[PDB]
A paper describes a structure:
Here we show that a dominant member of the human microbiota, Bacteroides ovatus, contains a GH115 enzyme, BoAgu115A, which displays glucuronoxylan α-(4-O-methyl)-glucuronidase activity. The enzyme is significantly more active against substrates in which the xylose decorated with GlcA/MeGlcA is flanked by one or more xylose residues. The crystal structure of BoAgu115A revealed a four-domain protein in which the active site, comprising a pocket that abuts a cleft-like structure, is housed in the second domain that adopts a TIM barrel-fold. The third domain, a five-helical bundle, and the C-terminal β-sandwich domain make inter-chain contacts leading to protein dimerization.
The center of the cleft, which may accommodate the xylan backbone, abuts onto a deep pocket that likely comprises the active site. This hypothesis was confirmed when BoAgu115A was co-crystallized with GlcA, which revealed electron density for the uronic acid in the proposed active site pocket. It is possible that the specific interactions between the uronic acid and the enzyme encourage GlcA to adopt an open chain conformation after glycosidic bond cleavage. The direct interactions between GlcA and the enzyme are as follows: O3 makes a polar contact with Nϵ-1 of Trp-249. O6A and O6B of the uronic acid carboxylate form polar contacts with the OH of Tyr-420 and Nϵ-2 of His-422, respectively, the endocyclic oxygen interacts with the N of Val-426, and O1 makes a hydrogen bond with Asp-206. Indeed, in the BoAgu115A-GlcA structure the loop that contains Asp-332 (Met-327 to Asn-346) was too disordered to be modeled, whereas Glu-375 could not be built past the β-carbon. Furthermore, the loop also plays a role in stabilizing residues in the putative xylan binding cleft, notably Lys-374 and Glu-782, whose side chains are disordered in the GlcA bound structure where the loop is too flexible to be modeled.
Author numbering:
A (entry chain B): 32 to 329, 341 to 381, 384 to 853
B (entry chain A): 32 to 327, 340 to 854
Amino acid sequence: EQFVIFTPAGNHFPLVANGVPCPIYIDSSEDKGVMIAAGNLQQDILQVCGKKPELLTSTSSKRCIIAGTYGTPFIKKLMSAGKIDKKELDGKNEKYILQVIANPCEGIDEAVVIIGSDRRGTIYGIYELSEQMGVSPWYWWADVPVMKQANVYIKPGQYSDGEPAVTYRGIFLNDEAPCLTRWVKHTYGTNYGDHRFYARVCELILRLKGNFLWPAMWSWAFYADDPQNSKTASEMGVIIGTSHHEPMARNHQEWSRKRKEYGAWDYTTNQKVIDQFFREGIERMQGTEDIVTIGMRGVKLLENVVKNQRKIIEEVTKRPAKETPQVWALYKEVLDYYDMRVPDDVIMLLCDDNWGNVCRLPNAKERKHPGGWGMYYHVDYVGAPRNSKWLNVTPIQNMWEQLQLTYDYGVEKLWILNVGDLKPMEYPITLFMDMAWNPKQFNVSNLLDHPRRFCAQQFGEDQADEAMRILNLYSKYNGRVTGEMLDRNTYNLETGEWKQVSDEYLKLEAEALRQYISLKPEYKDAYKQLILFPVQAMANLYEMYYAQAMNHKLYKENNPQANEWADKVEQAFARDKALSDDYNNIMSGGKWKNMMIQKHIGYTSWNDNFPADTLPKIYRIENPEKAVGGYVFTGQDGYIAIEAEHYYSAKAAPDTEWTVIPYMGRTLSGMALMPYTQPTDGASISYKIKLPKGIDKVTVHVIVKSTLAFHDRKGHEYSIGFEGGKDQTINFNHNLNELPENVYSIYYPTVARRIVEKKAKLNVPNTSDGMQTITFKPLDPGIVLEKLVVDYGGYKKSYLFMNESKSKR
Amino acid sequence: EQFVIFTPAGNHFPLVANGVPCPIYIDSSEDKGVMIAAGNLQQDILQVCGKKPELLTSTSSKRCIIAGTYGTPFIKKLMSAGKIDKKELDGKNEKYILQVIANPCEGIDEAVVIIGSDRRGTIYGIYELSEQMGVSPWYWWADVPVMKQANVYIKPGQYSDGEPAVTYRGIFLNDEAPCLTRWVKHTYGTNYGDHRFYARVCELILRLKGNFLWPAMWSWAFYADDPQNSKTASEMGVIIGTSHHEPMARNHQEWSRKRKEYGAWDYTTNQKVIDQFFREGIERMQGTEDIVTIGMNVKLLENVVKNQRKIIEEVTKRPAKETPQVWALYKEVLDYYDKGMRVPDDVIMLLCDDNWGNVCRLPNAKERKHPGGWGMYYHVDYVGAPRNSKWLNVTPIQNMWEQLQLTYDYGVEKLWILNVGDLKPMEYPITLFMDMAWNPKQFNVSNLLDHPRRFCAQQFGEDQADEAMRILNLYSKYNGRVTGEMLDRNTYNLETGEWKQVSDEYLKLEAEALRQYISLKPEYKDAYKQLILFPVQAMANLYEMYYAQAMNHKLYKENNPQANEWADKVEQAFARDKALSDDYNNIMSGGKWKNMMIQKHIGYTSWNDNFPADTLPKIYRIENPEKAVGGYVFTGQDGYIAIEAEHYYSAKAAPDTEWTVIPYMGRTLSGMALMPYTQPTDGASISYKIKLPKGIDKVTVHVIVKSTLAFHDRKGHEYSIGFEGGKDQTINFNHNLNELPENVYSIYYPTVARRIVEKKAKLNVPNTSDGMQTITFKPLDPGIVLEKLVVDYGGYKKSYLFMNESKSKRE
Ligand SMILES: O=C[C@H](O)[C@@H](O)[C@H](O)[C@H](O)C(=O)O
């Protein structure tokens, strides 16, 4: 695989040495596609080493790069210069051989030689070299830097990716408004995708070793909007197709724009016009490799359409229909129809369910279909049950798992990926393309090596593992539920599931942020696009909805903590906006402005009908300073853990106030009678609980601050007991001193941990009462009550004394 | 309070206008301390505006700053001219008045005037002006940037911090090796703390408005190592003391270093030498404001004190009461005092916290009349039982406040001295401590957090204050739970999710600190790292290390090869701990703080750091983890059994297929699928062994498979699920997952978007003699990916992740 190294070494070809690149020889007979690729190679080398290689007029230099395409005597001489068997490329599809060859031809001492079995092979060779020299396919589309190199040497040996397993390997730009469309407008000034735009797309497809494109078709018409569109793709070597409901090489919008003139999209009543519309599509794609969509939705009718479309193809081409590549999509009713006559030569394009699951795969008879089978796969969708157009939400595993299946069932003629706006599907696109190239090189053991190599490529070797880990995780997390379908109820609040997934995503963000700040500066934009932004956007969205669910829970409980969670919803909502603003406007100098504007907060339907991202509903407790006391707890799972601030009522001693010390202690806060200069006589603080009826004993754990015996050598006491029962008086610190028996056995162990936990076994006075009241009475000043746990079988020893039990006030 | 503003305004004094600072006049009569402070003021102004104010030779400039100290004739003349009453300062302690004054003296049209009741007051005035112009006390000690200003104006009015509530307000550099000691050696090129180092310390103390210092005494001797030490402190205006075990103004090391000559630290047998050692301490500190530690059976201790005070009188030719003295009551001594030990009236009785921020003893109402007053020695760093805390700040904001307010309310107001360890990273507690000692009654529970908020505003700017304060408060609280040294895999409860909770929560805090960090203007990054980010990251990571270690041990005991991942995480976090500290030491602030963050903190088995180095916590790895598959047995708890599909007991593949784990596949752990999908599944099964309570006769089993569709056969995919000893229930999980009108919107699209298919099967539990059940999943069609099973017998709660996996072990 890896033939480029970045240090000089003997019997290694010096492609760049001491900053100086060798020149490039392309024979002038080569297709313009090869030339375009060679030109990009030149530029890539310039990016790599700082000097532009010369494009040689003739076979004259000691060391150079030679690229060309099988079928030429120049290339024959070169293949027997040396020792490359014709059978390595003869009749092969989209294959290159890359090899350092000594004395390749008279006037050249040594060359790295790239020979394609056809022009795309040659292109793929060229781009393989470009890629291995450190120009990612994503150098432009995700601002992946080209690491500068003084030296670039090529290993001896013969290098090939072989032939692609899947014949046509493509993306479909779709769901393209508003992001791609406004981005294109912003970047190119055009209210359509013009050839400058499609030149970038096509360069990307080819660098990814794809060869196929369904252009954007919502409001654009690839063939019609810019007469250079087709020529650009075609000369670069990208095969163009149309989506499954765009027959006969016409873009949907060519009809829609002239609907009043064309009239009805109905074959039974408007056939002459539709046939002619069709005919013109075929005429226009003659001379190209484009694949012709057949069929039509306005069974004997559909066959007649297809019969007629194929006649039209024959009339236009003066060739049998079989010689024009065709695809018939088995998209909906049509699949039912098929379960109908389809000619042998036609690619039967099967569809996923729009969510990455294949619906139908051919059986063993079906697989004998000479035209082959296709798969149209989604990583972006607008439709039921809800649009997924925001972030990548395709788990790496799921794409792999269904594509391996797809290939194993003999679907190998055509793979086409709905990529939405292209960004931010950069990774799945790459996986898709690599899998279409060679699905059998992938198995469960090595799957993650793919995102690993991708991350090595995008962010460097030293970042690959950790970036891959995060890429894999965010893809998984996002697979769970799309941002659009995520809301306050997706996850279970009461079980801790929501907190778990929210905390987990934030942990992933922390990690992504560590990685981000560790990057060399030139990787930051790519990492932001490919890793950090999706992670932060989703982690924050999670927290928003998590905080919302908490807000609602606590609001129903009349607990003024609801207000904090409301703040968090507002903050996260604002953060969502700041994150996208940064992606659009700041990142990459605003190169991707409008690529990240998809509405995602406010869906009440499958479609994003609603105007804009909108604040999830939250509630606030008015006068939260007064919303204190009145807490009643319901025991669950055998215990009641009570944060001391959640008292039912309290009564202060004279010249004192029960005071909440927020954050005090290990958990929520502390309650203390203040000031400490006053006796506490008659103060108490009471907690109301609901035990299951019948529980007759509890062990109450009382957690106070590790206050020491500062006022009175006897130490501090409080009493704890049920209303209606006997109060136990506990002296919680009389042993917290330096006396030999105490100093190591209890004193130092205790004080370093800042709390004192005392247990009181209490008899429940009447086990028939609905509520019990536990009352804490500080008998000495300076006692800070932090927590109580009423254990009736379920308490598990916990440093935080367990999650607070259910309550409401 | 705030008298500096940063725009021009009428009736406001232009201290800096147009980038140009007005000059400074200090009368020649002023103490050198004031001069030193005025010199720093000059520098500070230079930092702020870019131009160094002139130190005027004489009272000749239209506008200038004038600072001086009550009692000089120059200041006398100045106050009896518009319009400052003598009573505002006469006899006041460490007070300033700062006031714009018109025609303050012959030759000056207008001045901002700072008048201290004494030289420290003046100094504090000066530094108040520095601070309000934007020079934090932490400008050097935590690299807090000085926001440049073209214009700095002073509000009219009279400004004062009053008198400090607590007379002596100090820090104790302690536990100082290896960090402070090596940092000093590295920075000052000395093997001891010299006067240049102590000048920085003293500058910090004075800018914080403290006045007191117990210098580092482990391997250094402040008085002896550099003869300029004492002079420097003394002339700056910092009072020097020694720690409670260093009587009579001798540093402990002065004894230790001459222990052969000396020799026994025993008053009963080596009194002549010890008395002389003492006498020399008192001779040496004459001329200074230093406070003399006294003390050293009860009759013996009284005799020592009697003799120390005779020595003080002999040396000073004055009554002992005129020499400030402090006698620490900890341990036996406190009992002696209770038991009835006579302490002379003039002595400051220094009470001690428990080394962990809790006061041990406060004076009662009678005791509080002690004329010498009372002291509190408070710790935010400690080397001792039960275990050293000398790594990070671990003092919750609330705790320092809560005990210090108590301390003050009980009339302990002569002397507050804070053990600060290496000083860094206790920057915040030190500030809180100093501000509280200044004025404890300024603080209450309702405004407490405004203190760290102002601190964060000051250090990181206004726009960062709230969020930095929030993190500061939280990390301080989190650290208060348990010290890094005392934290280990057993601190938190693993089984309840507590460990995960606190680990995840700290990492969330780090995420937040990181957001904040990367939002900062670049000049704040070093200070924020020192003050917020590093402690947060260091602790969050430490938490994860120990959390991962606990998980490792749990899973290892279960013979579950997942243990290995957790082991990786322990190694990684261990390595991260090192990277974090390396950055603090070497990269942050250009390596200014090299060696300040080298404390050992991973490896404690006992109270002291007497182990060679931070060391990898013990982890265990399952050898041959690819073979450590199957053999899982689950124990139901809480009314359900949630089973990740990979955790099967046994499996049998169909011919030419292999049960294959697809890691990460699905919503939780992974997926199990018979591969490849080109083969019929005839006879394949995968079985899970569970322990139900024997009373259970029916369960609803939720079977979670990937939303695979009917790709091979229009009938769709089936599997069977059932108990060994019971009937296998066949479920067709996707026959309805198609575009047929009945299905397309009701079930098809709602299902596939969520990537899974959950089917419930009510199963009867067959009666087994073992109490064990085996539940068996049989894919009858290719391409089925089993992800999870939940066996619900009353406890299942509908959950998107189908609830935390139940307890299991294998083999
Ligand atoms: O914790 C402090 C160090 O262990 C000692 O040098 C110190 O002298 C004593 O333990 C103290 O804390 O005052």
